[PDB]
Design a protein around this motif. Structure first.
Motif, PDB file in Angstrom:
ATOM      1  N   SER A 216      33.090  49.128 -75.474  1.00 62.94           N
ATOM      2  CA  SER A 216      32.232  50.170 -74.927  1.00 62.94           C
ATOM      3  C   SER A 216      33.047  51.444 -74.721  1.00 62.94           C
ATOM      4  O   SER A 216      34.190  51.387 -74.259  1.00 62.94           O
ATOM      5  N   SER A 217      32.460  52.590 -75.059  1.00 68.88           N
ATOM      6  CA  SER A 217      33.205  53.838 -75.179  1.00 68.88           C
ATOM      7  C   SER A 217      33.132  54.684 -73.911  1.00 68.88           C
ATOM      8  O   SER A 217      32.591  54.276 -72.882  1.00 68.88           O
TER       9      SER A 217
ATOM     10  N   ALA B  50      36.039  45.775 -71.092  1.00 70.92           N
ATOM     11  CA  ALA B  50      34.882  46.449 -70.531  1.00 70.92           C
ATOM     12  C   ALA B  50      33.807  45.442 -70.154  1.00 70.92           C
ATOM     13  O   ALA B  50      33.422  44.576 -70.942  1.00 70.92           O
TER      14      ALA B  50
ATOM     15  N   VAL C 290      29.712  56.164 -73.004  1.00 69.01           N
ATOM     16  CA  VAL C 290      28.990  54.905 -72.843  1.00 69.01           C
ATOM     17  C   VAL C 290      29.112  54.416 -71.409  1.00 69.01           C
ATOM     18  O   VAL C 290      28.111  54.230 -70.710  1.00 69.01           O
ATOM     19  N   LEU C 291      30.350  54.228 -70.944  1.00 70.84           N
ATOM     20  CA  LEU C 291      30.591  53.854 -69.557  1.00 70.84           C
ATOM     21  C   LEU C 291      30.065  54.909 -68.597  1.00 70.84           C
ATOM     22  O   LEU C 291      29.340  54.592 -67.642  1.00 70.84           O
TER      23      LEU C 291
ATOM     24  N   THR D  85      26.244  54.613 -68.529  1.00 67.64           N
ATOM     25  CA  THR D  85      25.675  53.344 -68.100  1.00 67.64           C
ATOM     26  C   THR D  85      25.958  53.063 -66.637  1.00 67.64           C
ATOM     27  O   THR D  85      25.231  52.280 -66.017  1.00 67.64           O
TER      28      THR D  85
ATOM     29  N   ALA E 287      29.836  48.189 -68.677  1.00 69.46           N
ATOM     30  CA  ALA E 287      28.931  48.593 -69.746  1.00 69.46           C
ATOM     31  C   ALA E 287      28.451  47.412 -70.588  1.00 69.46           C
ATOM     32  O   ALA E 287      27.645  47.610 -71.503  1.00 69.46           O
ATOM     33  N   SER E 288      28.939  46.194 -70.319  1.00 74.90           N
ATOM     34  CA  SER E 288      28.434  44.990 -70.990  1.00 74.90           C
ATOM     35  C   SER E 288      28.592  43.811 -70.030  1.00 74.90           C
ATOM     36  O   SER E 288      29.662  43.197 -69.979  1.00 74.90           O
TER      37      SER E 288
ATOM     38  N   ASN F 151      33.981  42.422 -72.477  1.00 67.47           N
ATOM     39  CA  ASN F 151      33.491  42.966 -73.742  1.00 67.47           C
ATOM     40  C   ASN F 151      34.039  44.382 -73.856  1.00 67.47           C
ATOM     41  O   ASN F 151      33.340  45.348 -73.540  1.00 67.47           O
TER      42      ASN F 151
ATOM     43  N   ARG G 250      41.406  52.334 -77.779  1.00 64.84           N
ATOM     44  CA  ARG G 250      40.820  52.754 -76.524  1.00 64.84           C
ATOM     45  C   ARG G 250      41.890  52.458 -75.491  1.00 64.84           C
ATOM     46  O   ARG G 250      42.948  51.930 -75.854  1.00 64.84           O
TER      47      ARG G 250
ATOM     48  N   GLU H 243      35.660  39.021 -75.029  1.00 66.99           N
ATOM     49  CA  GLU H 243      35.700  39.875 -76.227  1.00 66.99           C
ATOM     50  C   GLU H 243      36.019  39.013 -77.454  1.00 66.99           C
ATOM     51  O   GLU H 243      37.135  38.985 -77.977  1.00 66.99           O
TER      52      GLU H 243
END
Lengths: 192, 48
Positions: free
Chosen positions: A181-182, A162, A185-186, A189, A165-166, A178, A157, A100
């Motif tokens: 990711s929200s 994360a 989103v998770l 994905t 999701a990345s 990373n 968050r 990150e």
């Protein structure tokens, strides 16, 4: 380890032999360790954290002292181990989840809160001592590390990093940090 | 569930011994030895 259950000493092992008892060293010697450690990992790594890394060492030392004044390494719970490894693992995991990219003070304090929690919080058995460790950390932090805003560990968050999701395609082996990711989103994905 | 969610979908193969109520501890430990040789000599990305 000192005599507790399986731990014990046979008298004759030191019959004509000397023993050198070793236990927790001095807090200021520990800080001479860990302040230069935080130097070489945050002051020598990020300028935005070079300008506050000192109070981070302070937020480390005093918090750890409060927690070990409140909970014991091997006296009440073998689930506990308070030693040099407390802050040792804190600083190593500070030196392991640096991805990150471009750690602002927000993310350095995030990862440090992760380090302190994951060495102390789920070391702990239930709600009340959890909240005691939480009180120690919030107090020591917002006395020391209270200048730029860094507690994005929680309000941004969850205190997480994360990757599902990345990622990278084949080498998820070492998943890539990373933490941007929200929620859904998770949740969307991942069912992929 | 979430264990292999994470670990498998973090690429470290989830190595687990095929076990029953009487499957061999000998065979268990030898497959563990295979795991050992993999992870060490091969640097195989695993999560036991």
């Amino acid at each position: 380890n000192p005599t507790a259950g399986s731990f014990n000493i046979t008298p004759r092992m030191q019959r004509h032999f000397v023993t050198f008892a070793v236990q927790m060293p001095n807090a200021e010697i520990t800080r001479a360790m860990y302040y230069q450690i935080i130097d070489g990992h945050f002051s020598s790594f990020d300028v935005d954290v070079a300008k506050m890394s000192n109070k981070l060492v302070d937020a480390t030392c005093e918090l750890h002292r409060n927690v070990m004044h409140n909970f014991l390494p091997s006296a009440v719970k073998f689930h506990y181990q308070f030693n040099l490894r407390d802050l040792s693992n804190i600083t190593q995991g500070l030196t392991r989840a640096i991805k990150e990219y471009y750690r602002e003070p927000v993310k350095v304090a995030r990862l440090w809160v992760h380090e302190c929690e994951r060495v102390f919080r789920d070391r702990m058995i239930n709600e009340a001592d959890m909240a005691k460790f939480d009180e120690f950390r919030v107090a020591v932090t917002k006395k020391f590390f209270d200048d730029c805003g860094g507690m994005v560990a929680i309000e941004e968050r969850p205190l997480i990093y994360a990757s599902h999701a990345s990622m990278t395609y084949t080498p998820e082996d070492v998943p890539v940090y990373n933490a941007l990711s929200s929620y859904d989103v998770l949740r969307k994905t991942l069912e992929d | 569930s979430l264990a292999r969610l994470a670990s498998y979908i973090c690429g470290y193969e989830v190595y687990q011994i095929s076990v029953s109520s009487t499957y061999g501890i000998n065979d268990f430990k030898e497959n563990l030895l295979g795991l050992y040789r993999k992870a060490g000599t091969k640097g195989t990305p695993i999560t036991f």
